[PDB]
Design a protein around this nucleic acid. Sequence first.
DNA 1: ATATATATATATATATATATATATATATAT
DNA 2: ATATATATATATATATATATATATATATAT
Lengths: 212, 198, 99, 246, 335, 94, 233, 134
Amino acid sequence: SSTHIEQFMPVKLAQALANSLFPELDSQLRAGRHIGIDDLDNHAFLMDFQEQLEEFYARYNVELIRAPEGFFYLRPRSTTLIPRSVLSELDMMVGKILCYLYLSPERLANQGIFTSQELYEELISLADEGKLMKFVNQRSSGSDLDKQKLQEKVRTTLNRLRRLGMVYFLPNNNNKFTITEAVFRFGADVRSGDDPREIQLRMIRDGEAMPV
Amino acid sequence: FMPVKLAQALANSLFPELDSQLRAGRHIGIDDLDNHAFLMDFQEQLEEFYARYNVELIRAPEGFFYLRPRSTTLIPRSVLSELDMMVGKILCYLYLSPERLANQGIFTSQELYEELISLADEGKLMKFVNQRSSGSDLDKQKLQEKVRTTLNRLRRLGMVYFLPNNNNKFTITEAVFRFGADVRSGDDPREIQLRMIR
Amino acid sequence: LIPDLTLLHFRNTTEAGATSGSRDKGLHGKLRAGVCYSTLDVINSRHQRVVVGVRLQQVAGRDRKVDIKPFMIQGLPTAIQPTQLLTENVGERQARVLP
Amino acid sequence: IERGKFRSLTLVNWNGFFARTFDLDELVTTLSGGNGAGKSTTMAAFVTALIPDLTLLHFRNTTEAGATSGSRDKGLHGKLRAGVCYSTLDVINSRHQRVVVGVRLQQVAGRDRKVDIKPFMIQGLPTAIQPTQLLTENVGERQARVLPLNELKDRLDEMEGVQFKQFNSITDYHAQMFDLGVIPKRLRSASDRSKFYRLIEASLYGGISSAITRSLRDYLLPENSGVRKAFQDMEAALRENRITLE
Amino acid sequence: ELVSWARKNDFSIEFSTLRLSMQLSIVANELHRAAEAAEEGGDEFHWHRNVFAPLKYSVAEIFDSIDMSQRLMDEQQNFVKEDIAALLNQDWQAAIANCEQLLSETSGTLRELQDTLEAAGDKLQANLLRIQDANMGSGGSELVDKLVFDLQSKLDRIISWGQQAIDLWIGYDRHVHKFIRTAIDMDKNRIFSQRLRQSVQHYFDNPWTLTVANAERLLDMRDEELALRNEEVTGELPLELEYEEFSEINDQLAAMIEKALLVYQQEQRPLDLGAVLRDYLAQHPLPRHFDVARILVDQAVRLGVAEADFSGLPAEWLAINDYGAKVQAHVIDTY
Amino acid sequence: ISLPVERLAFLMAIAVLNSERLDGEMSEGELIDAFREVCKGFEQTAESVAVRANNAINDMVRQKLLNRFTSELADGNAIYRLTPLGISISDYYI
Amino acid sequence: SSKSVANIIRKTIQREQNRIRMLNQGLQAVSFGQVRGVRLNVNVRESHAILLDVLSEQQEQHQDLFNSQRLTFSEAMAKLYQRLNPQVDMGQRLPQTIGEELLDYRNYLELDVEVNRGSDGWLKAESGALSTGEAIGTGMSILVMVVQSWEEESRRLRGKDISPCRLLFLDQAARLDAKSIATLFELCERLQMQLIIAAPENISPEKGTTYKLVRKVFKNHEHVHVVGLRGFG
Amino acid sequence: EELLDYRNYLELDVEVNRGSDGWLKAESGALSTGEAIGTGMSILVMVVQSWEEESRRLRGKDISPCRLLFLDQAARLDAKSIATLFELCERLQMQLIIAAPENISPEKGTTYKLVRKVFKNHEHVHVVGLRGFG
DNA sequence: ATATATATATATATATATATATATATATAT
DNA sequence: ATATATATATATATATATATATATATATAT
Ligand SMILES: Nc1ncnc2c1ncn2[C@@H]1O[C@H](COP(=O)(O)OP(=O)(O)OP(=O)(O)O)[C@@H](O)[C@H]1O
Ligand SMILES: [Mg+2]
């Protein structure tokens, strides 16, 4: 009959969109924030009405995607109604390193709580110090001023990732943080045991990762 | 549950684009016939929907719709530069009556640039580009580039409709009245606008 | 003047408009055990001597409550004072207030 | 030990006061004068110098003390004249150090009766220099003029031994004052500032402030973190038990 | 204050539970002996040699020893964490059992230490309160109280740690399991880990970036810039403070009236305000009369009460001078 | 084992606070405050307070002077305790 | 965990009671109107002592309430407080806020102000049962005790060589009589407390310093003229 | 229903000619204690007069209701303000009961000195009266 | 190195719903 | 013919949720 919700929208989708949690979750998602198991309320909300939200967001030409690790996010399409952006290469370095720390048992004593200094030390341990520094400044040759510049850049990238939900600052401390499973996306190019050059094409075709 | 008419408005195929443009801050005037009619029809429910975001859906006296974020806004907020409001008031002034005989609704970047230079005070111009500047070529070129950038930013907001080409010549919409001042009985619009700008 | 328990609130001068804070209205503690009286004497424009008044009693109970009974007296002689009507000058040192 | 003392209070360009310095007493300073003399103005100026937090400052009449009057105006703007104004305190520290704390106040142009406040401190000023003169420049025949903060900084820096500091946040201002034995409590958090202002406000209007007696627990007893930690531990245990039960 | 002291100094450069039990037993014996000696009492020298030399040194030393044992356990916890961390690097999926055992033994050891600590904490506290009770037997035993107040906290402090450590460890433990349940479950062979490491090392040979939603921010109107008021105010600077002096005429008058009136209290003569005021006001000019009356009344009402005021009979308004001044007061009888 | 004057003073302050601490626990939130106070007393600013404090705490932890435990609820999300060598070095003078 | 909680709350309450009871003897029978002395009454609340006992010994018996998915921990505590001790009859305040309040140890002590009015003993001080001067004196006593407590708490952080400045205010002092003002003066001087008082008339002619202010209209603006005053001439 | 009332159609404000400045809206925050008290008394007498005017037409033509007001803690006012208040009340034939703790000594009218004492183990207020001075 | 934008927390005042206690008229037992 | 119990209306004031304004930390960009 008329004046009846099923005329325009499914009942469960309307119930989900009328829930008190919908607005904060939608604003965060459109901002690019990933959702992990830690946000128990938001994660459960996404799980319960997961299908309604993928079909709703499809209207924006963006896929609400749940990675096998269990974290939801948004991937815009080429015809996205919501703009799209790509992380910096330094952001990739810090995200890969963050995934390593999530999987690294040596730092188990930290119990998941990490400081930016430790992250930088691990980054320089695994990466090429000076050749990575080259991107921070084209004229760097190990100068300690440029060293501090790279430290500051790493801190800034860490803050941006915090904005993306890959990392949480502690309820009182902004100098310490706890990693989230979302960081696993930084390894999507290696989660499959195949040739790297074919997986990169598969991902870029899927829209997962553009090149630089 | 949900209001029925709210569900109807959200379900309408126009809703995604309009919602994206509103959350981007764009102002919907009378020119956008379909969007303006949709907002007119479904305002009573979109106001509540966007109040759920601690934002207000405002229909200006001129008629155009927009979103005003509160302090508790759930949509990431941002603030226009000083040059942005200055340029907005310049365009609002240029929405003039002799304008009809001057440019017939189509202006060019040169008009805006000359108006801004002649009308604004030097100190604010330097504050825009840089304090230590004083009437130089590089500073003026940077000022022109920033003027183009803020013009693009206004275009993003729907304030200025570019005439389609790489060249900078556009038209000014009625929503620009947001930058304008209030009108009193017998006040000359030109005089009040210039007094505000000064 | 206004024998209404709802309105009568003798808060302290300080906190003249502030909230109650407590629950007492401050009237009960201003009375003494027994029967008390508060009376005005008025001379109208017509020059009628009228004694308006209220009888107060501390209502014995768990709380600090007061019972007020209004009354009016007309036609009294000008030579009799209110304190005399309400008090018996018994032989004892102090008079006796009558109900 | 010798407790520090408030030597004097200086008022510049205030409503009625152009540049007036009241020398405070070791024990009691009294101000008299018919209604509207300006005593309450002096009290308000002092407290503004003490707690320049603009959110807290609310100069209600002694009548309707704490009774919402809905005026929408804190009353401070009308107590200042156009232009620059100053409110400063000279304090002798228990270390026998003369420190001049103070604030520059200035009305904000516009219909709203809004004010801007900037704190500042001076250390090592010679005992022979009076703040009234220090804050004014003798221009013309016996026609001294007030000078702004930048001019004051230039004048003081040119002197020897005087250290001038300007605070970007009332937090550091309170921290420095506490460091010099001027404030009993360290107002680290905004709640501490609110409690401090509540105390002085209750004193100014005098008597039993409803908020004070209502929060006497918070005002007297100190906060403990051990109890909070224990309650959080019990909370975690209960949460785990509920998880298991579900 | 110790910072300056350090600055001027210029200086620079056994987990077995049987132990803990034996120190606790030794402490119990010595504490009980000292408590009994204090309770028995004695002179100042006896009080000293029984409650200050034996108690102080022994209890301090052995509580420090118990704390040292707790610190050694802390070192062992750290070492076992490091051993687990190193083992998981070398065996990955095959160290799960080793780590679970190590966690089991560490948890059991911590629980046994807590049990041994609580095995004597309560009775030691009781003995310490007993010593507190017996301390007051002399006035010079102040120092004893300090120990009886100090040796409290340490003990309780020790017990606190005995639980707190477990509270920490039982937490850390969980994380390890979570790690095994999360880090290695989806990387059983660890191949993903090595492949991620090599990708990090050789990332820039194929630099790729992910895509994320970057919706636009809602541009807003900047509030009007705030402009203060500048007027360069100038004005005359105040002169030197003048002065004025307070008139003590009223003080002199009050002293006069108090002396004139004290006779009534001395003799307990019935005072009648009407007649007294009428007589006394004749000595002053009319304009001052009021300022006298008040004062006199202020002086008179402090002297006893009027018994007629309980009679219920209002007093009359007796005239006390010409020009129409009146007074209403009963005779003051009860002094 | 290498304790400059500032590190030694920080260690002595830590020991004093632990002695006067109620339950014998030290969160890093107080360790940072203690290092700030000692550095202020010594009147030297090589770098920011936070970086110096972090470097000193890490150096003492690796130099076997302090033991760290990760507790999120604790002020600073960590709890520090003097190690036997640190206790010995501190009480050698005290 | 519940037992440990209850224990730590009990210890903190006992310590605070002892501290406040020791502090109470810092008052010396102020004379304000018919108020002859001011005191602070600290007492553990039986309505909360029962709650502590239940938490420390009988946590399990009420698990049905704790483990309900509808109630949060604060709400669970509030409901448990409701269950036992049901005669308190709390108001319309929500369970969440009352529970949150229950989570603070200080709440468990009744902390009130007693006055030895006349010869009626020590009675709870209610503004509705006290004269203006009596209330003003009591409030000043409370404020001086509070500032003393704040000074005492900060004694550790501050240096050993600094004693913080002490200063309070009192507008419309004319509401106090001579006796009350003399008592206030003696209290403030005994406590080394500075006072700034205001009154239309010079109510304190023979103590401290005094100023008189006169406002003059002058060429379409205002000026305040200040004159010092002296006790005797 | 709000529109149905004529009173709602009216805007009412209280203005004071404060000093050199013109008429300004009476804001409690922009006045001293005495000024606020005096303005309050002024508005109160305004209200009393308005009520009497309204009620006159329903009363006997020869009835003038009593008018009486209070002022507690009158010491907040100076002598000048008190004299002005007395003049106003006299001009309006309005009775005043003013309380002042001995600070002020109004020469005109009746004065009542009170002193509290203990007699027969009971609190008693000794009362003395004066009048006619001036 | 510092101006500026942004997010968060707190205090403060408004507006509305609701429980409490009292006053007034009527009903019904004494 | 009376006084107590009921139902109704009212003001009081208590509490919650909202919206505003200010201070703060601090992360960016020239
Ligand atoms: N914000 C303001 N705006 C306008 N006028 C003001 C303001 N504050 C004070 N005034 C005026 O300044 C004069 C002094 O006011 P203030 O309250 O300081 O006086 P006072 O000496 O405390 O008075 P009283 O003792 O009668 O309370 C009075 O005329 C008052 O009206
Ligand atoms: Mg005043």
